[PDB]
Ligand binder design. Structure first.
Ligand SMILES: Nc1nc2c(ncn2[C@@H]2O[C@H](COP(=O)(O)CP(=O)(O)OP(=O)(O)O)[C@@H](O)[C@H]2O)c(=O)[nH]1
Ligand SMILES: Nc1nc2c(ncn2[C@@H]2O[C@H](COP(=O)(O)OP(=O)(O)OP(=O)(O)O)[C@@H](O)[C@H]2O)c(=O)[nH]1
Ligand SMILES: Nc1ncnc2c1ncn2[C@@H]1O[C@H](COP(=O)(O)OP(=O)(O)OP(=O)(O)O)[C@@H](O)[C@H]1O
Lengths: 427, 426, 325
């Protein structure tokens, strides 16, 4: 029972650097590389008294790889695993997918293949990236296409960062997203999306961080992606493996776009004053402003929901919690799945980083929910894409790489088909 | 790893380039001789991007200086950081251009281009992977406007895939220190618009207005203006020079800033800029920095941005700061001034950040803007060129080097096409 | 004073690479004016089927264009479409075969026949040039020494090329020999989608000057025959290496042409011909005193249906444009 966690782009490598410290603190692994089965999923055992993680950080520019090498987690990671390119993607899907990718995918595929051959209990892969930029779109699509053609049946967990409605970091983000999603629709088994302004607001209103940073944003994301696999890592009363996220949450082979959220989020002084029980966290996770994506769930319906709890929590109280949540009529479930709840529990409680913003909580829950609220976000993305497409804005960079307007039109009509499928299944 | 080739042409070009080398050497902690005495390992981590390693722990810059008189070379060699430059790179002729584009592009340019081409080829071969060619020149005068344009054309022919970046100073009607300056500008813009990928348009009167308004200096010389432009020249190149939470190289900012190949004439800016006596009475927080970035008077161009509309802008910050504050500041900036941003783009703003600010400042930023307001500065130079050209004034010197009036007519048509292109998207 | 730019559409037979894969012939013809693809009508001036011969296509396309360009106006004939659409087979064809020869030798033969039929008093002077685009540089195919050419504005600010070997011709045999030499000097590459893939836009210009000794009347005409490359899909082609660098220039040129066409269709103020030199050369063609003709080639296979639709709607945008003739 293992799974390999690969990272692409500045967002991916920063999330990896922010999360592997949490993993090593959870498993008791010091940064030097030394202190039975709990760490076997993400860390190997190299000879005697030494570990190495099952991960690769790949990026075209070297500005992230050299600082990762010269940081503080130097002796923990393999020196050769940190793959570095030679040229900048420059927020260009075509440049990240075609010119610069082709000279390093030959090494990357061989490296993942040889490090997977020694493994035997690999359940799947999880890829960290961001379609809002160039590297995390182009190189991710390039690798996932030739990984799906080779393995195919093995599971792939996509973790992407998407732009806010009113805020955007780049200017070619809708072009990058609409281009890469045309390939992500068929090869990605399931893809969790995160919005920047939602995760800025979640630490503003609750955690009381007036001036947060990307490290503070990535800490709770690392907590989420560690809590989903905490069931595999540690024993539980009702364990859920990685195949549950494929089987239960993907009712159709192309409708595989769930939203994500977490609870409780609380500062140190507020933790001692607020009580921790299942009821308030269950009410807060379904709260619309508490989600990690700026979408209104009230406008749509929940197609499916998997609750994963951590800490000393009995089954009875969570059963009562989901019962009263079902009787609550503020939310609305679709008629095609009345039994739309999948509850699971792990005994190992959440951990806290020394000096981190998060506080010690006796119990926690992560809520990945499949719903139709993302249809509005996709329609918004297509609407803002069409305004620039009509004027042919930022098209000369793409066509000067090797592409044309044909695959732009195919991306547009594929997004239209996605909207058609979502409005059809939401009826 | 992503090395940069530096080339300097003309009097003002080599002056601002020397100041750029001085300030970045001070930031990296490089002695005037060439030895390293820095405190942070990050300075040495990316010293190879500009400086070549030499014996005795010495570092020599990858700089090319080319001038059509020995006086500029003597001055920059006698400057504070003149000895650090390579003696081999001091290529120069004997006779000056005399403020003639034709002499710089045909007669002496042809004689010196073969001398500089192998030198830039050797410097390109020395590094592992050239990223782009950064150049500094002046549309005014003959030397820069001819020789830098010819050098750009030959390097574009030799490397049609690499980035071509230029920090070009251009004239103004209120301050014009040359009689042949509209002619030189009209001839040089025809070559700049077709060959160069990126272009930062700088105006002297804009820097003078800056030094009057916010610096409040009593005796502003060219040294202050060199330090002013060197700040933005370092701000654009900080992303590849140091790590950052959201890095944006030259190609990364170019892809966001260049929506079409011709509309690549930017409007650089930098802040904070304040007097030494008024530093205590200012809060350096990011909202008061961001308002100064988008202030109309703070830009380094004489054009009024409120009279036009921004095609796209980019803000590269330096120093530890909150990404939420940067995001919400850019949000309210693009929202409250929606009339001054084009509606046919959802987000006209790019953001980047570096984690190591300049010495002596805790936070800083640079603004790079492409807007329709540059059409004013283009059309005033265009009509100034036309008024002199319509009676064939100041052309008997140009005809001596085999230059024809059809070339001037083609340049005028190119200027008309460029200003109409900028007027189309307004 | 005002004349619509004439648009023609052609569908070709299915190729060996398409029939063996099992591509369906989705092209459906409803008369000559309109063509239907998946219940989507598209109206043009004349639609040609797979069975239409080279002579039939030439007589329908460029028969009266010879009269128009000889009268005093300008003529520009050029092709558009995707890869493996048949642009080379339409325009170049088989030079040795009288039946399989394309449009360009037939045009020269018609010009010479008209000159022979016309009386001897009207003196003619024909001069040809042949060049192409590679690495964003204009290569003159008639001389190997030159690697880049410049485009300069004439007296009335019409752009045209300079420095090319303007070969003054008198008989058709030397014209055909020069065309064969240019074709031999043309660079071609082998790909999965096409063997003799034309990886560059080839321009063939014929300046015909004429003067009447009796009336002392002079007339000049620039005849452009431009065979453009097809928009190559990277997934379908499997392009890697120098073919990618060729595709960069090809896609830049066709994207600039499409931007010009969209600007002219929507009625933009500036009409950016300056996006590329390939767009600058056709300034007089698209917005001058020229009676332009454009042919779009479409593959009837279901595999290339998306780019077929893109070419059809591109022709629809191009049809509404009017020139200032
Ligand atoms: N901001 C600065 N501007 C300068 C400086 N020196 C000159 N200039 C301005 O640039 C204008 C023309 O630039 P140059 O001095 O380089 C004339 P150039 O050397 O290219 O030709 P020749 O000297 O005739 O060989 C000039 O009229 C000034 O307005 C300077 O040191 N700093
Ligand atoms: N939430 C979050 N998003 C991030 C973080 N870092 C980067 N991003 C997002 O990533 C997007 C761009 O991704 P990339 O393509 O990898 O950008 P890059 O690494 O600089 O690549 P180049 O500019 O081409 O060199 C930006 O728009 C950001 O919104 C982060 O730390 N947290
Ligand atoms: N209309 C047609 N009728 C018969 N055969 C054709 C036709 N079009 C193409 N072919 C066949 O296809 C072969 C190659 O096609 P061709 O070179 O014309 O393609 P193309 O689409 O013009 O190419 P490119 O995109 O490289 O310019 C020709 O030799 C001929 O065998």
């Amino acid at each position: 029972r293992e799974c390999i966690s690969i990272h692409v782009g500045q967002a991916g490598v920063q999330i990896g650097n922010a999360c592997w410290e949490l993993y090593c603190l959870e498993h008791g692994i010091q940064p030097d590389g030394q202190m039975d089965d709990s760490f076997n999923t993400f860390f190997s055992e190299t000879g005697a008294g030494k570990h190495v993680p099952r991960a690769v950080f790949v990026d075209l520019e070297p500005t992230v790889i050299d600082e990762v090498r010269t940081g503080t987690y130097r002796q923990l990671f393999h020196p050769e695993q940190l793959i570095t390119g030679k040229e900048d993607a420059a927020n260009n899907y075509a440049r990240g997918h075609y010119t610069i990718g082709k000279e390093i995918i030959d090494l990357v595929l061989d490296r993942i293949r040889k490090l997977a051959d020694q493994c035997t209990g690999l359940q799947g892969f999880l890829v960290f990236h961001s379609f809002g930029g160039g590297t995390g779109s182009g190189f991710t699509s390039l690798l996932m296409e030739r990984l799906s053609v080779d393995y195919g049946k093995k599971s792939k967990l996509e973790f992407s960062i998407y732009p806010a409605p009113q805020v955007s970091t780049a200017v070619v983000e809708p072009y990058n997203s609409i281009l890469t999603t045309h390939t992500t629709l068929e090869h990605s088994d399931c893809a969790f999306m995160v919005d920047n302004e939602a995760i800025y607001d979640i630490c503003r209103r609750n955690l009381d961080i007036e001036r947060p940073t990307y490290t503070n944003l990535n800490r709770l994301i690392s907590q989420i992606v560690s809590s989903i696999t905490a069931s595999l890592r540690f024993d539980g009363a009702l364990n859920v493996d990685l195949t549950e996220f494929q089987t239960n949450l993907v009712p159709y082979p192309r409708i595989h776009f769930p939203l994500a959220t977490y609870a409780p989020v609380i500062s140190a002084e507020k933790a001692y004053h607020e009580q921790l029980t299942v009821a308030e966290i269950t009410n807060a996770c379904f709260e619309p402003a508490n989600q990690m994506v700026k979408c209104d769930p009230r406008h749509g319906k929940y197609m499916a929901c998997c609750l994963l709890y951590r800490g000393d929590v009995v089954p009875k109280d969570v059963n009562a919690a989901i019962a009263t949540i079902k009787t609550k009529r503020t939310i609305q479930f679709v008629d095609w799945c009345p039994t739309g709840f999948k509850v699971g529990i792990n005994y190992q409680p959440p951990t806290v980083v020394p000096g981190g913003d998060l506080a010690k909580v006796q119990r926690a829950v992560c809520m990945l929910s499949n719903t139709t609220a993302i249809a509005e976000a996709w329609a918004r993305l297509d609407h803002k894409f069409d305004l620039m497409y009509a004027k042919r804005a930022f098209v000369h960079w793409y066509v000067g790489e090797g592409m044309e307007e044909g695959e732009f039109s195919e991306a547009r009509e594929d997004m239209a088909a996605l909207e058609k499928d979502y409005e059809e299944v939401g009826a | 790893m992503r090395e940069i080739v530096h080339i300097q042409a003309g009097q003002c070009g080599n002056q601002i380039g020397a100041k750029f080398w001085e300030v970045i050497s001070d930031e990296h902690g490089i002695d005037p001789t060439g030895s390293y005495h820095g405190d942070s390992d990050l300075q040495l981590e990316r010293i190879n991007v500009y400086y070549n390693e030499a014996a005795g722990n010495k570092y020599v810059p990858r700089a090319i200086l080319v001038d059509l008189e020995p006086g500029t070379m003597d001055s920059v060699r006698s400057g504070p950081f003149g000895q650090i430059f390579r003696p081999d790179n001091f290529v120069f002729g004997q006779s000056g251009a005399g403020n003639n584009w034709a002499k710089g592009h045909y007669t002496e340019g042809a004689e010196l281009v073969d001398s500089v081409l192998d030198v830039v080829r050797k410097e390109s071969e020395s590094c592992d992977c050239l990223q782009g060619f950064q150049l500094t020149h002046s549309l005014g005068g003959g030397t820069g406007s001819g020789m830098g344009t010819l050098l750009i054309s030959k390097i574009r022919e030799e490397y049609p895939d690499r980035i071509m970046n230029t920090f070009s100073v251009m004239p103004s009607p209120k301050v014009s220190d040359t009689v042949v300056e509209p002619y030189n500008a009209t001839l040089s813009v025809h070559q700049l618009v077709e060959n160069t990928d990126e272009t930062y348009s700088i105006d002297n009167e804009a820097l003078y207005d800056i030094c009057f308004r916010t610096l409040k200096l009593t005796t502003p010389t060219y040294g202050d203006l060199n330090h002013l432009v060197s700040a933005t020249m370092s701000g654009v190149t900080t992303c590849l020079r140091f790590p950052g939470q959201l890095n944006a190289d030259l190609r990364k900012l170019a892809v966001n800033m260049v929506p079409f190949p011709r509309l690549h004439f930017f409007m650089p800016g930098f802040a904070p800029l304040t007097s030494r006596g008024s530093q205590q009475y200012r809060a350096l927080t990011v909202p008061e920095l961001t308002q100064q970035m988008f202030d109309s008077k703070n830009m380094m161009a004489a054009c009024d941005p409120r009279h036009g509309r921004y095609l796209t802008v980019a803000a590269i910050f330096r120093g530890r700061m909150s990404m939420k504050e940067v995001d919400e500041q850019m949000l309210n900036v693009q929202n409250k001034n929606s009339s001054y941003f084009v509606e046919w783009i959802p987000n006209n703003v790019k953001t980047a950040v570096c984690d190591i600010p300049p010495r002596g400042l805790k936070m800083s930023a640079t603004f790079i803007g492409n807007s329709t307001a540059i059409q004013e500065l283009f059309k005033r130079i265009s009509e100034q060129f036309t008024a002199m050209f319509r009676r064939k004034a100041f052309l008997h010197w140009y005809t001596g080097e085999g230059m024809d009036e059809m070339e001037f007519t083609e340049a005028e048509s190119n200027m008309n096409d460029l200003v109409s292109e900028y007027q189309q998207y307004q | 004073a005002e004349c619509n730019i004439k648009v023609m559409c052609r569908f070709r037979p299915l190729n060996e690479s398409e029939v063996n894969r099992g591509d369906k012939y989705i092209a459906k013809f409803q008369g000559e004016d309109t063509v239907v693809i998946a219940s989507k009508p598209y109206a043009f001036d004349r639609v040609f089927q797979s069975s239409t011969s080279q002579e039939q296509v030439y007589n329908d396309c460029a028969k009266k264009i010879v009269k128009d360009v000889l009268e005093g106006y300008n003529g520009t004939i050029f092709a558009y479409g995707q890869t493996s659409s048949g642009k080379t087979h339409t325009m170049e064809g088989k030079l040795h075969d009288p039946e399989g020869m394309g449009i360009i030798p037939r045009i020269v033969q018609d010009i010479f026949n008209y000159i022979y039929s016309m009386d001897e008093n009207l003196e003619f002077h024909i001069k040809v040039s042949y060049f192409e685009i590679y690495l964003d540089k204009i290569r003159d195919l008639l001389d190997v020494s030159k690697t880049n050419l410049s485009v300069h504005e004439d007296k009335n600010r019409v752009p045209y090329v300079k420095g090319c070997t303007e070969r003054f011709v008198c008989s058709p045999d030397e014209v055909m020999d020069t065309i064969d030499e240019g074709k031999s000097n043309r660079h071609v590459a082998v790909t999965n989608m096409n063997e003799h893939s034309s990886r560059s836009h080839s321009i063939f210009l014929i300046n015909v000057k004429q003067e009447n000794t009796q009336t002392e009347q002079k007339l000049s005409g620039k005849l452009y025959l431009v065979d453009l490359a097809g928009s190559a899909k990277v997934s379908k082609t499997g392009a890697e290496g120098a073919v990618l660098d060729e595709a960069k220039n090809i896609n830049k040129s066709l994207s600039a042409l499409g931007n010009v066409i969209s600007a002219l269709a929507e009625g933009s103020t500036y009409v950016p011909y300056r996006d590329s030199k390939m767009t600058r050369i056709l300034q007089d063609s698209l917005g001058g005193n020229c009676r332009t003709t454009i042919v779009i080639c479409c593959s009837p296979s279901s595999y290339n249906e998306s780019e077929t639709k893109s070419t059809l709607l591109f022709g629809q945008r191009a049809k509404t444009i009017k020139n200032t003739v």
